[PDB]
Fold this protein.
Amino acid sequence: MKLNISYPTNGTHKTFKLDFKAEQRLYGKKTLDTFDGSIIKPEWEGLQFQITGGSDVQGFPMIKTLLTDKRKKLLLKKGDKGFKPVNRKGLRKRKTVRGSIIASDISMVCVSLIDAKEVAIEGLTDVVVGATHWPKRFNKLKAKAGFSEDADVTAEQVLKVIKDAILEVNAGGIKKLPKLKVSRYQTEKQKERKAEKIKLIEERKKKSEKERADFLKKYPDWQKKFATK
Amino acid sequence: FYEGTCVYSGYPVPRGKGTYFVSLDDKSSLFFSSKYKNFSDKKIKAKRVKQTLMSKQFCGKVESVHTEKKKKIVVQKIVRGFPALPKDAVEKIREQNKDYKK
RNA sequence: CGGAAGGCUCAGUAACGGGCGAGUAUUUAAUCUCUAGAACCGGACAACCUCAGGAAACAGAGGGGAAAACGGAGUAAGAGCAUGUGUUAGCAUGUGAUGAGAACAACAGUGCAGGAGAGUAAGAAGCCAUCCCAUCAGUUAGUAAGUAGGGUAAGGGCCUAUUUAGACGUAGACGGGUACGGGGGAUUAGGGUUUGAUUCCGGAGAGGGAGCCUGAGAGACGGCUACCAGGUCCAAGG
RNA sequence: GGAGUGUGGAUUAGUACGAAAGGAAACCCACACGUGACCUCUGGUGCAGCGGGUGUGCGGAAGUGCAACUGCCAUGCUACGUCUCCUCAAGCAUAGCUGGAAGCCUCUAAGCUAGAAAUGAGUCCUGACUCUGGAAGACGGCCGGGAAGACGACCCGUAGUUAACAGCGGUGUUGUACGAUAUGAGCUUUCUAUUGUAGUAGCGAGUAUUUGAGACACUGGUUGUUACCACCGUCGU
RNA sequence: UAGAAAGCGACGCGGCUUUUUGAUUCUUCGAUGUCGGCUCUUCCUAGCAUGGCCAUGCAGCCGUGGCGAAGUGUUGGAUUGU
RNA sequence: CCUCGUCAUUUAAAUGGUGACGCGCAUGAAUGGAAUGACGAGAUUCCCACUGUCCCUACAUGUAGACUAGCGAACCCAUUU
RNA sequence: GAGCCUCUAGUGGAUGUUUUACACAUGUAAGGGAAUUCGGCAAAAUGGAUGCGUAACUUCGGGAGAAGUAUUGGUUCAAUUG
């Protein structure tokens, strides 16, 4: 049996083999259970872990809401874990899955360490990493730009963030400089187009409203002439 | 060591006692004793047999999975943790921004 | 945005299966004409990154991140009901469930929200014509009708409750056997007798039966689900 | 007196042997029939114990008789359950060794070796006549029990972890007591004060709470209370 | 298949058994309950299986003729009173 | 009689049952012959349901029986077994 | 005026012991279902009322309750014999 450990403060991962006695002490648990590291290893006292998921040795996934030690077949839609539909909308299919309760069937258990405390777990504690992408949306970007509850042109914040990258990362360089872009804030091309729609409605009104009066000048007896079919 | 959990009663079964009954539907099922197997055959609903663990859970006399209403532990706000920007500098920028905003 | 068309066959069906008229008691993405739009906020899913399962087919954890994708806020709009007035649109008044919305590029354009009328396609209907056996004479009880309600896009025993006994038959009912139906084909002085799987139109099916999600539109099978009859690969667990 | 008997699978092996086709030979493991025991498990049985309904009795409810029906089930008994079953010695038929008669030969005339699910012993059941030991008292009845039992007989106890009743612990069987209170498909509109207001109800199968409740047993655990120290006979010094 | 005698053995001749049916009338007619089945025990050997051996027309497999041996086995059914 | 006649059907298997056949030891017409209905505590064969009849027996109840108080016989008998 | 239960009126003795085996009257039984036996002998199963649905043959009266199937308690209502 493998054990796969994630440390979400650091963004780091490690896999280990268990021994028999360690394994046998996990039996009976389920996803979203917790335990103390001392039950897996000597030391590791007070490290609290939470169980995330895993896999049958046949390869079927453990599902978070099927509380049994057995395999079932379920009918699954899009948005259900264990199924990945592609080429037709409204497709639903029947697949084998395993319940959440841990036993000798399982090949791998996934686990999250909540807090490393004073301990020095190799690989988990020795590295710190960030994200992969950058906040495109304006208000998400602003919070990261350190500001809150004040008004700027986007250019200001793009300048701040770029300069800080040049300074803090490279101390000067053309490296970094990912292609920062901003959504949900009005640029000048938008100011013009958003003015134009106001021009349209104002004329369409007057033109429509004119013809009504122009008609009534000529046809006082509109209704009595028209209605006699 | 246990043999398993009885299907009808809900009772855990000691090693070396009880029996499995296998139906033509292809299912295998474990019973504590002849008493509860017979009650199944005669279509007595388990929730009405008041000494069963099943009945006691259903009535709410015994705490069970349905009572739990569990929810994910809520955390707090952090000093804006964002790529590159060191945690400590944001602790400073946020303050400086708040000043300027006033 | 399309995969609901076209292609193949004639098993089932004596019937909305076929010919002629009519346009409703109905729904319709695209397309046309007229008209026609001041709106804020939030998370995820897939791919990406780090581990990593399974014999394969096929899947996991953890963390970012978009939309003209999605969910909420206000706001226009707004079904039904009731009374006036104009059949009947419309308008007035009272009451209100519900409740949104796309821009982008300049090679100089392409899109998307609402209405009203067209246009295309279905659903349901009117009339008339349809094979053999009497060694098959009585058949039917949602059957025939009425009142009221549910259901549907919509009329209706379509379905249900209480009342009335009807409906159809020797001018062949009911049962059984047999059949894709026309435009047409072969023979022919005339009157006839025989055939139509088969370039066009319309119907039904996808091994046999039954259920279904998505969509403007399928009871779809080069979509899904279960049984019955048969098969294929395996490391025997799928 | 007597007890274990047989079958199959795997391996030798697709081997020896045969032209080919075909095709053998210990040890180990599974089973059947027979024998002797045993209840931990699983069936069966329901005497003790807990529940339910039908007809009719004790004014109603509660507790219950009679006719009998019915769900569960301690201890016990049982098989459809579980455990059980080989080793020496003398030697049959035979095949051999040495060897005369009969200078050669020869299992036999003397002598010797290998030898059967058969025979005789041991392990297994019954137990004749015996043998070794203690002590002036011993033993039987009467009283109370069972692991024993037709009656006798056997195993045991009598001032004590003795018996019986209660607490308080422990281990089971049944299935949620009586009485209150609340609800209940529906059906109904009664009373007091007094002129008009206020007061103001009945009848009802069942279901939920109090309540894994109440009932019943056993305890070689522990506390309290109560009862029991006799008597008669026989043989001996 | 050669060849009396692996296995057979004509035509004749000598025995044993009492499990078949006869033959005879010794015992019982002032009474010995008469066929078959069911149940249960013991004995015999002229040996069907199981153990040890000898011959072969015994390659092997399957057999056939003989010797000492009676310990343990020899069943469930259909028609019929059998 | 021969005889458990031959052929078909019923069963895994039929000295049985039913259907056929007929030189019938020794069938047969009021010494009454032949084909049916309704009704038999009449004789016979098969199927469905059902079961301690059986495989293969086990447990439990009442009444007798064993032991004890009161009461109290008979059959049979050459008897030494 | 069946069986079962009660009112009026009438009624009873060979003693004590928890009492083996074999009996005689009775209950219940896993899996199998006539294998039992001359033979289903004995036992089990079916059972009242209401409705649906009912064959061969027949002297036309019958067969016929053919066979085969479903319903049934308590309470509170409607409707008046359905």
